[model samples]
Target: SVDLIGINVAGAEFTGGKLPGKHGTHYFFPPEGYFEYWSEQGIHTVRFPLKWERLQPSLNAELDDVYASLVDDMLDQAKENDIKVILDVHNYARYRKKVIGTEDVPVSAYQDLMERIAKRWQGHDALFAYDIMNEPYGSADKLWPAAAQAGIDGVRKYDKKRPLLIEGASWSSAARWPRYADELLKLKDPADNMVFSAHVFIDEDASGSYKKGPGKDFEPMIGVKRVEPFVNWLKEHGKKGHIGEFGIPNDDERWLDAMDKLLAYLNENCIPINYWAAGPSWGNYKLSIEPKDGEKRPQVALLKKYAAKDNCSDFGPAKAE
Candidate 1:
């Protein structure tokens, strides 16, 4: 029921190369990396994480000329290729060290990135969008809204039209969506342009798992799957939603079947999706980050059957009689 829906074929951020099977020999997000084959994948919606390290290397959080040139170059590539780009300013600061009392990219850091990015790429048509500070948290249920709104407000100060991709805090676990919906519903974002993204990854054959919940048996999928209520509510309330990331590692029948169920459920309800990914492999969310994790996996084929023509931008729940 949304205008556009799809996946994030990640892995390009840390590893995009053109050396044939080498990550980032030829790239997409400048300062070097790419998916030469991705344009051929017949998918229109593409997501890639742009990192803080790539942009700043000093205390001033300064951008070397390469960083600015990088954004311009990447935006041009998307325009040239006719691909819709979701520029995810991806960061994992939720669990790591960061400026005290501040969030990822910090206040000045985030504002700097937003203003520069928006000023530079504002008129590229719909060539680019944003995912403000990937996966942030810690007392976040209450704290994140301020940071998110500030980030959005910063972007508006520069570019006023392009959609702003907003990721719900607490690693995008929206079990709080219902409780916090009112709070979120109050913030003003561009109509039909604001997208609420959440991620979910599965675990199997392990003591520790996303399945275990917060060590309290809160079915995370139920949290994610329950977005149907939110999606329906978005319709009733005038908003939009996206399953920014939801996937399991194994590619066998059991895993595939499980995903099939999740996919079917979302498709049935018309929720747009952006599979959690970076490449042909299960690059991150390591067994270290997540125990019982699998490796070097490919999930594109799973959604390939559903990949849309043109831009994967036109779709709705498979109509039911």
Candidate 2:
């Protein structure tokens, strides 16, 4: 069975590039009630996205106390609901539009950001893993790996027990993993607690736009095919894996069938998964699984079918049995 099944509680990363944006206008955190709602659906894990620009306005500096306290509050809510949270740095490897590992944004800056974050929340009972960056791209061949390693090293300095979720380069696309992100295999964690994260979508362009319905060319195995390479890479390297993001438009039932097959594949393989998004602010986002008008979305039904019923006690790297 899949070790964990959850949803991306996205919102804090909204209005990208709006440094310290107004919370309720441009962005917001998951509402306190969301934790209890998802817990009732058997979802005990949440991938919580946060903007590095807001967390630490200046590189190598302290996190903004106001923003950091907001994070603490979220964690407290998660703990109260018995939900584990994966803290996702959703900056896409940039700060203020400057790519990480560049002269303008040194790798050490990313390291410092992670170090400060780890030191601040290491004691939180609800903190699950540190997703260093989300969908990093546009860096040179070795730059992303170096920067990811630096983040891992920095987190290890204080929080050695939490798993580090490392996303591949090139948008963390599972289908393009081998061509664009094979170098990520070189990343080492002293704690040996790392989970390779990948995102996949079944639309024609695999972009999760879902502007069009599943066409005649569609097949239920499309999702499985897209994600196989990443799963294989993890198995070959003896690493744990997670689907940090994946979702389908709510208007199409074919997409739900595809998702069911995908989840079954992941379940048989013992990998964990988190749907692309669900948050109080996603009023009409097609892929959002957030409830509407007091009813859960259609996607949540398929998700509940695969949701882990027991607590996720295994946080170690996947191994061949």
lDDT of 2: 0.85
Each prediction's RMSD over C-alphas, in Å, is: 7.0, 2.0
lDDT of 2 at 130: 90
Give candidate 2's error at residue 168 in angstroms. Answer: 0.5
Tens digit of per-residue lDDT, candidate 2, span 199-301: 9999988889987899988898999999999888777777778889999887777888999999888876767888988987988888888887754478898
Error of 2 at 156 (Å): 0.1
Q: Provide backbone clash counts, one per model.
A: 15, 0
> TM-scores of the models, in the given order?
0.70, 0.95
Best by lDDT: 2
Error of 2 at 281 (Å): 0.3
Q: What is the C-alpha lDDT of each candidate?
A: 0.55, 0.85
Clashing pairs in 2: none
* Model 1 C-alpha lDDT per residue in residues 116-148, reported as the tens digit of each score: 667666777645567776776555556567667
Candidate 1: misplaced stretches above 4 Å? 1-5, 11-34, 57-62, 92-96, 99-109, 139-141, 179-181, 190-192, 204-226, 229-236, 280-298, 309-321
